[PDB]
Amino acid sequence: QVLRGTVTDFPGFDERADAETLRKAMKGLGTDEESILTLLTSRSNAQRQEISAAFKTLFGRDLLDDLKSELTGKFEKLIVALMKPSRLYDAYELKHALKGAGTNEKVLTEIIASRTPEELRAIKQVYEEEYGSSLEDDVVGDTSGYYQRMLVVLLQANRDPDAGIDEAQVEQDAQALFQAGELKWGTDEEKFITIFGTRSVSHLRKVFDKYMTISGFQIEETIDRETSGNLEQLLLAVVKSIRSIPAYLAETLYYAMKGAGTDDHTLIRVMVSRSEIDLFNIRKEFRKNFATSLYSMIKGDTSGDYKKALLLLCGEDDC
Amino acid sequence: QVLRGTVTDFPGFDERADAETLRKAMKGLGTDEESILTLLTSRSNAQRQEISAAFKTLFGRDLLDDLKSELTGKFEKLIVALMKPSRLYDAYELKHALKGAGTNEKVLTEIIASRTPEELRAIKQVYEEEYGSSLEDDVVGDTSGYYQRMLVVLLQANRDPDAGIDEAQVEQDAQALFQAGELKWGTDEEKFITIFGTRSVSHLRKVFDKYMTISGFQIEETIDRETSGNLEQLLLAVVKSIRSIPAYLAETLYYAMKGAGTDDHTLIRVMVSRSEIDLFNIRKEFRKNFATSLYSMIKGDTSGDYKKALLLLCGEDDC
Numbered sequence: 158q159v160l161r162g163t164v165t166d167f168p169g170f171d172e173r174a175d176a177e178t179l180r181k182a183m184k185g186l187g188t189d190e191e192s193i194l195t196l197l198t199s200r201s202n203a204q205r206q207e208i209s210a211a212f213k214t215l216f217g218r219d220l221l222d223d224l225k226s227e228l229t230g231k232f233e234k235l236i237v238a239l240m241k242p243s244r245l246y247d248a249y250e251l252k253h254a255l256k257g258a259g260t261n262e263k264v265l266t267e268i269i270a271s272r273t274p275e276e277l278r279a280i281k282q283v284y285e286e287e288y289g290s291s292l293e294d295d296v297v298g299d300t301s302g303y304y305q306r307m308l309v310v311l312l313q314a315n316r317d318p319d320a321g322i323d324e325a326q327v328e329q330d331a332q333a334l335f336q337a338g339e340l341k342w343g344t345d346e347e348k349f350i351t352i353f354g355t356r357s358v359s360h361l362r363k364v365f366d367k368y369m370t371i372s373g374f375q376i377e378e379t380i381d382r383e384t385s386g387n388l389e390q391l392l393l394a395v396v397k398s399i400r401s402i403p404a405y406l407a408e409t410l411y412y413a414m415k416g417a418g419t420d421d422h423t424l425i426r427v428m429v430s431r432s433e434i435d436l437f438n439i440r441k442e443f444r445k446n447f448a449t450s451l452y453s454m455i456k457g458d459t460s461g462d463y464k465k466a467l468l469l470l471c472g473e474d475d476c
Numbered sequence: 477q478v479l480r481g482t483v484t485d486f487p488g489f490d491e492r493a494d495a496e497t498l499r500k501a502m503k504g505l506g507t508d509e510e511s512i513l514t515l516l517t518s519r520s521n522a523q524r525q526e527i528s529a530a531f532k533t534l535f536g537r538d539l540l541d542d543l544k545s546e547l548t549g550k551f552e553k554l555i556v557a558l559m560k561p562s563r564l565y566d567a568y569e570l571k572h573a574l575k576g577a578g579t580n581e582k583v584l585t586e587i588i589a590s591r592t593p594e595e596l597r598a599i600k601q602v603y604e605e606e607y608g609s610s611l612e613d614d615v616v617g618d619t620s621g622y623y624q625r626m627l628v629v630l631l632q633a634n635r636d637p638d639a640g641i642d643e644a645q646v647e648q649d650a651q652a653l654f655q656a657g658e659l660k661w662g663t664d665e666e667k668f669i670t671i672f673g674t675r676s677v678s679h680l681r682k683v684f685d686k687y688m689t690i691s692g693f694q695i696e697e698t699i700d701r702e703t704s705g706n707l708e709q710l711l712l713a714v715v716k717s718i719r720s721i722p723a724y725l726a727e728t729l730y731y732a733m734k735g736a737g738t739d740d741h742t743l744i745r746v747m748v749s750r751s752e753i754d755l756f757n758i759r760k761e762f763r764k765n766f767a768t769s770l771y772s773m774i775k776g777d778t779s780g781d782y783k784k785a786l787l788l789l790c791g792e793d794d795c
């Protein structure tokens with residue numbers, strides 16, 4: 158009855174002993190990648206921050222700097238991602254995505270659609286603290302269309318509270334959504350944006366069910382997952398996140414490794430950002446919806462120290 | 477970093493609708509065992525109590541009475557066990573085991589060794605409320621030897637709190653335990669009983685480790701698990717519960733189905749009593765220590781509606 162990650166506080170945690178273990182793993186010309194990945198994936202993010210502090214006090218060096226030069230490639234990127242303070246991770250990912258003409262719209266859609274209003278408020282505050290500009294201003298300056306508008310409405314974090322059901326409002330909203338979809342989501346955008354972005358989660362779940370009975374198909378089938386534009390991809394992410402945030406992020410992981418190549422940025426981002434929130438539930442939705450475990454997918458697509466750290470973050474194989 | 481069972485509160489729970497579902501499953505000459513086991517194993521124990529209350533209000537019948545006549549065999553016993561209020565289950569199991577000359581010492585040892593001081597205090601209060609006789613008097617009246625004495629000390633629920641380590645006391649207690657074991661646990665029983673029963677869990681874990689270095693073998697190997705008397709079986713249960721309560725109860729499940737025949741009473745008791753506390757960690761310990769999942773063991777040894785309900789209580793297969 159609760160969300161659950163795969164990483165928890167290590168019992169009997171001694172930040173000074175862990176700092177010594179990590180320094181022993183890199184002092185000298187050699188490296189003990191196994192010791193580094195085993196310790197860091199078994200300590201919580203808060204514990205990693207205390208290790209980094211004890212590391213600086215004991216040895217007068219910077220742990221993150223040492224890891225960046227001692228490690229390489231995707232393994233380095235994963236370890237560096239795990240060391241980023243949890244409170245800063247999403248704000249950092251969004252700022253990195255906001256790239257003017259080269260903006261990574263997948264990251265904007267992923268984070269803004271799947272984070273709760275509480276999380277988005279914290280992100281907006283942290284974002285201004287770290288970068289001196291508002292997240293909304295950066296998004297507006299770097300996106301266009303009603304994709305921009307829907308992101309702005311979601312960033313407002315003003316979603317209705319899970320209150321009593323209103324079947325009269327569940328009929329009219331579902332009627333409106335059926336009709337915006339009939340017009341290919343290119344008409345009256347502000348109205349379906351207000352429905353997708355401000356109605357309560359429990360309400361929209363009933364609206365999506367009422368959409369089934371009115372239309373004969375689920376609302377997701379009005380949007381092609383591969384060829385649609387940015388707004389449509391955001392609507393799909395919002396719909397799936399309304400149904401289940403773990404299921405949306407599980408599908409995000411699935412398509413990160415499906416087919417030729419691997420989207421390692423998305424793989425690292427989802428496993429790290431959700432490791433202490435709902436990665437266990439993501440694993441369950443993954444096994445149910447794609448007939449194979451997240452563990453087996455990671456094992457088949459990745460290699461080296463990078464793979465073992467990802468498998469330890471995944472925690473277990475699912476059957 | 478938390479214990480976790482396999483059964484949680486059903487979301488959107490409606491006790492009147494569930495009562496109607498259960499009545500629909502037994503009204504008439506037929507029975508829908510699938511509907512009964514699917515609903516009852518997916519509702520928490522507290523929710524089952526509200527279903528039974530709504531059942532009596534809606535229909536003027538007793539749900540437990542209806543289940544007892546509609547179901548048979550081990551399936552009936554499992555469903556009846558799940559319906560017993562959680563607050564009463566251990567006290568009922570102990571009273572049922574306290575049978576004078578036919579006393580079931582395995583149940584006494586299992587519950588009293590693996591329950592926390594907090595749980596034991598609740599059990600003692602409930603036991604008096606339901607049966608009019610303190611739990612200690614019945615235990616003393618139906619047990620003998622220093623097995624009786626060690627149970628009484630454990631029932632006192634006065635174990636030292638997890639405080640700061642004392643390596644000097646960890647040397648002396650382990651010396652004393654090594655020496656009681658050298659005398660086959662038949663000398664100065666009150667002295668190792670005080671150590672096993674009143675020292676803190678974290679202290680005894682260090683004592684058990686210090687016992688390794690002093691003796692060269694773990695303390696469990698001074699007791700044959702199959703031929704040992706009642707006191708020795710209790711010492712083994714206490715030692716294993718000090719190391720890990722989930723691991724002790726996992727081993728209890730393993731030997732409940734190992735070999736010829738099935739100890740269905742123990743199987744039902746552990747799965748039900750630990751369904752909303754630590755059955756998930758029991759499943760984990762089971763897979764590591766016995767190279768096979770609890771799911772696979774239940775599947776291979778049980779049958780019918782009884783098996784299905786046990787597998788749903790188990791939750792998932794472990795891999």
Ligand SMILES: [Ca+2]
Nearest residue numbers: 273274275276
């Ligand atoms: Ca919130």
Ligand SMILES: [Ca+2]
Nearest residue numbers: 291293294297
């Ligand atoms: Ca602004």
Ligand SMILES: [Ca+2]
Nearest residue numbers: 316317318319
């Ligand atoms: Ca709310």
Ligand SMILES: [Ca+2]
Nearest residue numbers: 502503504546
């Ligand atoms: Ca009947």
Ligand SMILES: [Ca+2]
Nearest residue numbers: 592593594595
């Ligand atoms: Ca308590």
Ligand SMILES: [Ca+2]
Nearest residue numbers: 698699704708
């Ligand atoms: Ca013995």
Ligand SMILES: [Ca+2]
Nearest residue numbers: 787788791792
């Ligand atoms: Ca299932």
